[PDB]
């Protein structure tokens, strides 16, 4: 099984640059590394990754994702790398990363994180606690840089935001 327009090699499924509007069916359940980056994804329906329990890397960077559903990563307990950079995300659902105990590389930069809203506090506390794995780049050029997740319209890092500077009434 392999989606047309993706490159399949063993437990790698590389859909990087496929111009997909939607996640394709037919990604093998034994897949270990999944590139869905550089497509036109705008949403993820709940459960889309639930049968992909062997994933160790998931790259969703360079799409138009406006939100993530609660629990979308809950079955991926072997995940080490997660790419969410260069999307349209305004917050992360509460606890979205809790079931990802093996993460070593996370990309969150270049999103319009909405730091006025109380929904940002999960992400803010998470980045503060897991600062040593938040970064940028690739292979030789990987660099830890937790301040690169920035509040939209400011130069304030998401991890500097406190509850007192958020409001439940400023959440679209
Ligand atoms: C199929 C493959 O190996 N693709 C590589 C691709 O993943 C690399 O892009 C980087 O992906 C990471 C995680 O998704 C991150 O988005 C990097 O962006 S960043 O702004 O530097 O943080 C992407 O550059 C590229 C790197 O040139 O290489 C492909 O081979
Ligand atoms: O290619 C580069 O220039 C380094 C990787 C990209 C890092 C991005 S650029 C926007 C955002 N702000 C940062 O300080 N880093 C990320």
Numbering used by the authors: 1 to 172
Share the article's original sentences.
As antigen receptors, the lamprey utilize a family of highly diverse proteins called variable lymphocyte receptors (VLRs), which contain multiple, tandem leucine-rich repeat (LRR) motifs. The resulting VLRB protein is a 15–25 kDa, crescent-shaped protein with a continuous beta sheet where its concave surface forms the antigen binding site. Herein, we report on the characterization of a lamprey VLRB that is specific for terminal 3-O-SGal, and was isolated from a lamprey immunized with human type O erythrocytes. This VLRB, termed O6, is the first reagent to our knowledge that specifically recognizes the 3-O-SGal determinant on glycoproteins with high sensitivity. To better understand the molecular determinants of glycan recognition, we determined crystal structures of unliganded (apo) O6 and a co-crystal structure of O6 in complex with (3 S)Galβ1-4GlcNAc. This O6 VLR is relatively small compared to other characterized VLRBs, containing 178 amino acids (~19.2 kDa) and only a single LRR variable domain (LRRV1) along with the other usual LRR and CP components (LRRNT, LRR1, LRRVe, CP, and LRRCT).
